[model samples]
Target chain A: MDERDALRISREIAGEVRKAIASMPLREAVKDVGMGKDGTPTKAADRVAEDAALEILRKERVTVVTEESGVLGEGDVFVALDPLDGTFNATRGIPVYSVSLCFSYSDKLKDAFFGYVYNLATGDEYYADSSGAYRNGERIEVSDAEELYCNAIIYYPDRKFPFKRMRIFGSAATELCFFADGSFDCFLDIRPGKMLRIYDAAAGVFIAEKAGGKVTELDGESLGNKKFDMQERLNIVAANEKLHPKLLELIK
Target chain B: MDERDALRISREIAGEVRKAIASMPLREAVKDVGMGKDGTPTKAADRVAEDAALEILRKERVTVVTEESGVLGEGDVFVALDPLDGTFNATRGIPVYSVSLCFSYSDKLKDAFFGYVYNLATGDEYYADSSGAYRNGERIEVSDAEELYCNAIIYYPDRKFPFKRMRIFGSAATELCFFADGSFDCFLDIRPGKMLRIYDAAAGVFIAEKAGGKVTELDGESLGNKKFDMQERLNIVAANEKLHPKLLELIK
Candidate 1:
């Protein structure tokens, strides 16, 4: 399917997923059910969200690589999906969780054609296509901030940094959109373990790159070669062209 | 006024404050208006919330100490107010910010009689009196976690620790309530800069304490002496009776 078709299917899946989790209380939603294909303990909320997403996506002609249920279907197009990005936040009633999808022409990120992320709590939609990137129907781009004393969204800050503000909202997909819309100057995931999976960073990185952000790995290399599989891990450093290099240097 | 009177006044003020901020669009609310009395640039949202809170509070017989307007009025009762606790999150439409208030018989926290914090976006109310702490009419208490491998809401993680999960939502007041309601095991802001002010933390601390949390300074000293004034700064390390001492040692 093309970008238009992918976008339509993504929106439909988001609607269903949002409805599925809205009524479940935290006590029931946070119960550990079983082990997911991603080798992590799957929460009841995650299972419910993935069930909703996969039910709709099964009608489409694409291979779905997801968190809880793993790979499903076999088609030319690959869609890396995180049914619920921040399950912990969702279980605690914090409003920063979302569903993310990245549609690629092939199994590699270099062939990506469409990306979408929808915040389940706030209902904020972020997407990117050949035309451009948008947040809730408005065109968006990264900030041209060049100073270290700027807003940053980093994971597990192990030392002091000179940022005007540092925030960790516990949701990588939504936080990436925050940077894509210039809400924050940059987004860094420099945790030593490099704990981000393909489904976690694919859609976010795709959207940010379309929004004029220079997204790269920790070693200042391109992420286009990354594949959409369970074993693919990521360490991202995303910002505008002017500020991206500065971040790479500081983290080094 | 007594606890019942304080509760009535707090609920009235909360309604007005919520309505005031609900009508403001984030684009307009995020504009930096002027320097606040606390020596920080106040946003339009902050001004509107503080105005609503001050209008209702001025009719009472209490001295108000707030972020933008500082200390005002001359009365025996002292109220530390943070009209908008998570200004940055509110400006970004993150839905975690709140209006916080702590009422004391005298200027010090040792005489605090009532504490209230209301989330303007989600309409969640948290408060405490001599009897106990409550979240939306339901009694609440801190999580009974004794090990270091528990959920924590810390300001900034300067070093690695053994917590199962770490989060920083950018709002200390609401996060403290999260600890009170057993959503998180601990709430820490051990930044050496002493960034927290009396208005930003007094209400949350009081509610957590009433909920069975041992809220104290970094050195494990009692926070009873903290005064309701702009000049007062804080470095908190809060947890249950068993877990409180462990956090202090880890941070030290």
Candidate 2:
């Protein structure tokens, strides 16, 4: 599908997922529905959101690689999807959770053409295509803070760091959009075990890169080879160009 | 004022502050309006919200000790107010910030009769009175999770610790309510410098305590002695009765 078509489809999925999750109460939302292919317990809210998203995604000419149900369809275009990112936040009525989608021409991230992340709580939308990145329809870009002491979103702050501030909002996809739109100076998920899966971060990474940020795996490796499959995991370190190398050095 | 009157006044102040903050754009909100009595730069959003709250507060017989205006009036009842808690999040449109108010008969937390923390972004109301703590008018309580691997909202994770998850939403007042409602099992702000001011946490602590959470200083001391003034700072360790000691022991 083309960029415009991908955007339209992503918006449809987001709308459906938002409504599905919003209707469920916190008690029901947090119930464990079943085990996920991503090796995690799928919450009732997750299942509801996934069902809503897949209802639209299944109709598209793309193979959907998702968390709860795994891969589906046998189409050329591959869609890396986190039907409901930050299930914990969603179940708790926290506002940082989202639905993330990344569409690629091939199985690899380098072939990605469209990325979308929609915050279900606040109705804020972030997406990018061949043209550029946008947040709520406004053009967006990362911050230009060169200092090491800048606002950061890190998965686990295991030790004292020089950053001005650190936050872990529990949603990599939404957190990445936060970085993409200059809400924070950087976003790092440096868990030693490589905790993030493909669906969890693909859309965010794509959107951040489109918004003029340099995103790479730990040790400053390219994420181009990252595949659109449930098995492919990630360890992201993203920031503006000037600040990216400095972060790499500090973590190294 | 009685608990009922206190709640009514707090609701008026919260509604006014919410409108003031919502009217301003992020570009305008993040602008530095002036220096605050709390030893921080008051953002335009803080100034706007404080003005809105103070306009209603000045009519009452309570002395308002807020972040921006310090102490005002010569009334016996004292109110510790964070006119706009989580200014950083508010300016960035992160949807987790709130306006907090704690009303006390005397100048100490021990005499607190009412506590309120209203999410300015989401319009979620959290408050506690002589009756009990409530979220959106429904009674709320802390989680019964007794394990060390429970969800936590901490200021800074200086080292590795056992927890199912960690989050820092940048607003102490709102985060404390998150803990009070059992969305998170614990809330700790163990910064070495003890960065939290009285206005930043009084309401949240009061609400959490009313919701059956044990809140104390870093050393497990009672917070009852805490003063209702801008000069007072706090380092909190809060959780349910069962998990509170476990967290204290682990942190120690």
Candidate 3:
């Protein structure tokens, strides 16, 4: 199928997942989602979302790399998925959680064709294709902010440093869009813990780049080589080109 | 007004504030908010919301205690108002901020008659009156998890101990409701920096308590006596009744 067709199917999957989760009471959402194929505990909410997303993706013959269930199918096209990106926020009802998807012609980001991240609670859709990024169908891009004193979204602020404001909303997929839309000047996931995965950053990176952000590794290397699947962990620095290097210097 | 009537008015005010902030572009919203009559920076977004709320409140003749303009009028009734509790979030387009109100017969929580916290991004209305707490007109309460190791919303995690997950959304008003509704097991602002003013917490504490939380001072004294205004500051330990003391001990 073409990219637009993929977008339509992806959106439909998101809607079903949202509706199912929305119908589940918070109490029910918090129950053990079952042990993920990766051995981490999954919430019932995560299972419901993953189920909805995979069912739609499977019909398209796309190979899926998903959290909770791991890799499945044998198709040439790869779709990295985080069925529920911010499980902590969802179970808590904080409303910042989302479902993320990144589609690639190959297992590597260099071949990525499209990316999507949908806010389940607010139903705000953020996505990017090979052409450009969009938030709810409007074009989106990063900010021209050049100062460290401008807005920022860092994953963990274990130590105080620079920036006028700092926030950690626990949803990296959407936060990447925050940078993409100029809502935050830059996005940094510099914690020593390395708490990010390919599913989290893949869709966001694609969107940010389409929005004119320079999404790269902490050392300013391209993420084009990053892989899909459970083996792919990530650390990202996203910003408009003008301010991207300064972040690399500041954090270093 | 009776407690229910006050709650109804509070809900109406919340609706206006949500529409006022949500309908505006972030770039414009940041530019338009006015300076606070109190000394901190005030965005035009905040002023618009405060103006909308006070116009309604003045008609009711409640003694209004707000951040930008300070307390106003002399009346038997007192209302602690945070026209925009999470200005940073609203400005940054983070979906976790709100407008808050707490009405009291006297300057104490013991006499609080109405409390409200509204999510400006999502229009989720959380409030408490004599009838108890409600979220979108549905009753809610804190989580029953009773361990210090449970998830927490802390202001600054200077030194972490045992919580499995910790977050700081930078919006005390909205975060407290997350706890009240059992999104997080507890809420904490143990920053020795003492950054939180009464305007941020008055409405949140009241709503949380009504939602089955036990909000108190660090020493376990009732927060029922914290005064209302910009000058008043507080540190809080909040959780469901079973876990409240455990959090107190963990912090100490």
Candidate 4:
């Protein structure tokens, strides 16, 4: 599917997923019924979200690489999907959870053409295309702060650092959108294990790049070679051009 | 005012503040309009919320200690108020910001009679009286997990530690209520500078304590001595009774 079709499908999937989860209480939504294809315990909420997203996406001509159900279909286009990005937050009613989707022309991040991250709780929509990045229909961009004392959203801060504020909202997709809109100065996921998967970072990276962010690997390398397969992991350091190198140096 | 009157006033203030901020756009709300009474930059959203809270609270008999305006009134009852907790989150359109109030018979925390924390974004209300702590009118309690391998909400993890998940949502008041309602195993703010002030934490601590969580200072001392004033700083370590000591020892 093209970028317009991808955007339409993503919006429909988000609406359906949001409606499904709204009726389910947090206590019942958090129950772990079984394991997911990704090797993580799938919550009742995750299953519901995936069901809604897949129902809408299966109608299109694209392959879906989702969190709970794994790879599906046989099509030239690849859509990296996280039906529910913050399961834990959703279960606790924390309101930072989202449904993320990245539409790629090929089975790799380099071919990504469209990206979207929609917050289920607040109805905030973030998306990017060839034109630019937008948050709730307004154009967005990353912050230009060049100091270490600026705000940050890091995966795990292993040591003391100089930051005016540090927040970990438990949702990478939404947090990336936060950085994309200049809400935060930078976003770092420098854990030693590189725990983030392709689905988690694919959409966020695309949107951040479109929003004037300089996103890269931990060592300041491009993510163009990152695959859309299950085994592909990520370690991102996203910031504006000036601050991006400074963040890399600080972590080094 | 009495417990019933305090609860009524708190709810009124919460509704007014929530409505004021809800109608405001994030870009307009986030502007740094003026300096706060506590010597920090006050955003337009903070001013709007504080003004709404103060307008309703000033008619009450209690003395209010708020974020932007410092202390007000000379009534016997003391109310430590954080009119807009998680101002940054609110400004960025993250849905975790809240209004917190702790009503005390005296200036000290030991005399706390009522505590309330209301999420302005999602309209989730958490409060505690002698009857017990409640989330949206349903009685809530701390998680009974005793192991360190549990969910935690900490402020700036300085060193590596053992926890299955660590989140810093930039809202201590709401995070404390998350701990109070068993959404998290513990809540800590162990920054060396002891950044949290009385208005920022008093309500959350009171509610958590009422929910059966053993909240204390970094030294494991009682929070009874915490005053309802601007100069009072805090370093909290809150968890269930069984897990409280474990966290204290781990952080030490």
Candidate 5:
């Protein structure tokens, strides 16, 4: 499918997931239904969202690499899907979770054409295509920050860092959109482990890049080679062009 | 005013702030209006919320202590108020900001009879009276977790620590309610700057204590002596009774 088709299918999936999740309560949402293909415990809420999202995606000719059910289909268009991001926040009524989708030409991130992340709680939609990044239909861009002591969204602040404000909202998909919309200066996940899977960072990284951000791996290298599969683990460091290198130096 | 009247006034203030903020857009909300009485740049959003809240609060017989306008009224009942708790989050449209209120008979925290924190973004209301603490009218309590490897809501993870998950949503008032409702295992602000003023934390701490969480200063001393004024800064460590000592020892 092309970029337009990808966007259409993404919104359909997001709509279905939203409806499916809204019908359930938080107590049922937190129940561990079973283990996911990604080796994490899948909550009932995650399963419900994935069920609704897959129903819509399977109508399109695309291969789905989902967080809960693993890789499915044999179409040329590879889709990285996180049906329900921030399961913990959703269960606890914290209201920052989302549904993330990244559509790639092949099984590689460089061939990505469309990226979408919808905050289910807030009804905020962020997406990017060949044109540019948009948040709720308005064009967006990364902040023009050129300093070390800027606001940062990090996975863990393991040591002292030169950041004015450090925040972690538990949802990387929505948080990356925050950076893309200039709500935050940078997004760094410098944890000493290969924790982030493809479904988690693919959509966010693609949208941030479309919004004039310089996104790279932890070593300040390209993410063009990152694959769209369950085995794919990533470490992201996203920021504007001027601030990206400064962050790399500080982390090093 | 009595405890029942405090709850009514708090709800009325939250309703007004929600309406004032809902009428404006993010760009306008982020504008710097003027310098606050607390030596901070007051955003247009903060001023709007504080104005709406103060109008409702002035009708009651309570002395109000707010972030932007400082102390107001000369009534015997002192109310520590944070009209807009998460200004940065609100300005950026992050959807975690709230209006917090703590009503006390005296200037000290020990005499507080009512505490309220309302998330304007999500319409979640958390309040506590002498009887108990409640979230949207449902009784709430702290999580009975005894292990260090549990969910934690912390201001800055400045150093390596043992916790399964670390989240900071930028609203301490709402965050304390999250701990009160068992959404998080603990709440800590171990920053050495003594940054938290009485208006910023009194409501959350009071609600947490009412919900069965053992809240204390950094040195594990009672927060009873904390005053209700702008000059009164604080450092809080809140957890369940079993886990409070564990966190205190670990931070030490």
Candidate 6:
């Protein structure tokens, strides 16, 4: 299937996922499920979401790399999926979690064709194609900020930073879209330990890039080679072209 | 008026204020109209809310003490009003602001008869009367967490003591209700500088106290002397009976 077909399928999946999650009670949402393929125990909400999405996606003949199930099927085309990106936020009713999907011809991000991230709490849809990025069907792009003292969305602030403002809403996929829409000047996962999986950053990075953001590794290197697998790690820094390098320099 | 009558009036005012703020557009919400009696510039949204509430309240002939306009009229009863708390969050399209009001026989919080804090963004109404505290019409109380390592909603975390999480949402009025409803373990506005204005804490402290929380001054003294004027300042340290003392000891 082409990028247009992927987008249609992703949107359909997102609608179903949101409906299912919204119907779940907090008790059921927080229940512990068996361990996931990503080396973390799946919350009941995550397992339910994964089951719903896979029911539709498995009908196709594409390989699926996800946070809960890891690799499934044996096909040339691969889809990196995060069924529930911010499980903690969702369980606590904090309203900052989503379902993220990234489609690629090859295993690496360089071959990405379609990327989508749908916020479950607010019903905000973000997606990107080869043309450009869009938020809820409106065109979106990164902020034109060049200073290190810019608004940043990060995982946690372990040390004092140069940013004018900092917030950790406990959701990476949605926060990346926040950066893509210029709601935040930049987005960084600069936790000292670098603890992020491929499913978390794949779709967000793709969408941000389409929205005129210069996304790369923490050291100003490219994430084009980032693979779609359970073992693949991620550390992303995304901002406008002018501020992208400055973020890297400041972190260094 | 009696406590029950005061509560009914407070809820009526909350409904009018909530509807007024919700109807305002984002661009129009931030425009400064005039200087308040508190010496701070009043945003358009704040003025509109205060106007709506004051119009409803003027019919009762009660003394209206508010952030925008200090004290008006010569009635035995006093009402402390914060037309719009968390204006920064409101201006940024971040949903975390509230319109807070408290009614008391005397200037001190100990004499409060009714309290109301309505979150303008989400339509969540939190209030307290002679009976108890309620969140959106459901009775609520402080959390049962006893350990110092707990999730706290403090105004300012000057020095990290032992809390697992610390957040300053910039809306002291609403943050107090978050504690009242058990959404947070504790609430502390112990900025040694005493920056908390009466309008910010009056309603919240009343709700917390009614919710079975041990609301008190920073020095563990009673809040009986906290006044109802622009010159009055406060330092709050509210939690459940068990954790309240621990927090005071830790801060000291």
- lDDT of model 2, residue A7: 93
**Chain A vs native chain A, TM-score per candidate:** 0.98, 0.99, 0.97, 0.99, 0.99, 0.98
lDDT of 5 at B197: 86
lDDT score for residue B30 of model 2: 95
Q: What's the residue-level lDDT of A211 in candidate 6?
A: 95
Instruction: Give per-residue lDDT, candidate 2, residue B110.
Output: 95
lDDT for each candidate structure: 0.93, 0.93, 0.84, 0.92, 0.93, 0.84
Top candidate (DockQ): 2
| lDDT of model 2 at position A247 | 96
Worst lDDT window (10 residues) for model 1 chain B?
Answer: B155-164
Model 6 residue runs over 4 Å out of place are: A33-36, A39-41, A145-150, A159-165, A216-218, A232-236, A243-252, B30-41, B68-74, B154-170, B188-196, B215-224, B231-237, B245-252
Query: Candidate 1 — what's its lDDT?
Result: 0.93
Which one wins by DockQ: 5 or 6? 5
Per-residue lDDT of model 5, residues B1-252, tens digit only: 788888888888899999999999988999999999999999999999999999888888778889999988998899999989999999998989899999999888999999999999999999999889999999999999999999999978889999999999998988989999999999999888988889889999989998999999999999999999889998999999999999999989
Query: What's the CA error at residue A252 for candidate 3, in Å?
Result: 4.4
Estimate, for each residue in A113-227, the C-alpha lDDT of model 1 and write its tens digit: 9999999998999999999999999999999899989999998788888888888888899989999999899999998888999899899999999999999999999998999
Candidate 2, residue A5: the lDDT equals 96
lDDT of 3 by residue, B1-252 (tens): 678788788878987787777677877888744568667888878888888888888887677899888989788788888899888777766777888888888876668877888888877888886677888989988998977778888866655357877787889998898888877889988867677787789888988998889998878888878776667788999988898888788778
DockQ of each: 0.80, 0.91, 0.46, 0.88, 0.90, 0.23
Runs of candidate 3 with Cα error greater than 4 angstroms are: A1-5, A218-221, A241-246, A249-252, B19-28, B91-93, B108-111, B129-132, B137-139, B217-225, B240-252
* lDDT score for residue B153 of model 5: 96
List, residue by residue over B1-252, the lDDT tens digit for candidate 2. 899998899899888988888888889999997898877899999999989999999998888899998999889999999998888888898989999999999999999999999998888999998789999999999999999998999989989989989999999999999999989999999999999999889999999999999999999999999999877989999998999999889988
- For model 2 chain B, where is the 10-residue window of minimal lDDT? B17-26
Q: Which parts of model 1 have CA positions greater than 4 angstroms off?
A: none
Query: Across residues A134-174, which tens digit of lDDT does each residue of candidate 3 receive?
Result: 98888987889988887878766565556776777889998
- Give the poorly placed runs of model 4, Cα more than 4 Å off: none
TM-score of 3: 0.89
Q: Is the docking of candidate 6 incorrect, acceptable, medium or high quality?
A: acceptable
- Model 2 scores a TM of 0.98
Instruction: State model 4's lDDT.
Output: 0.92
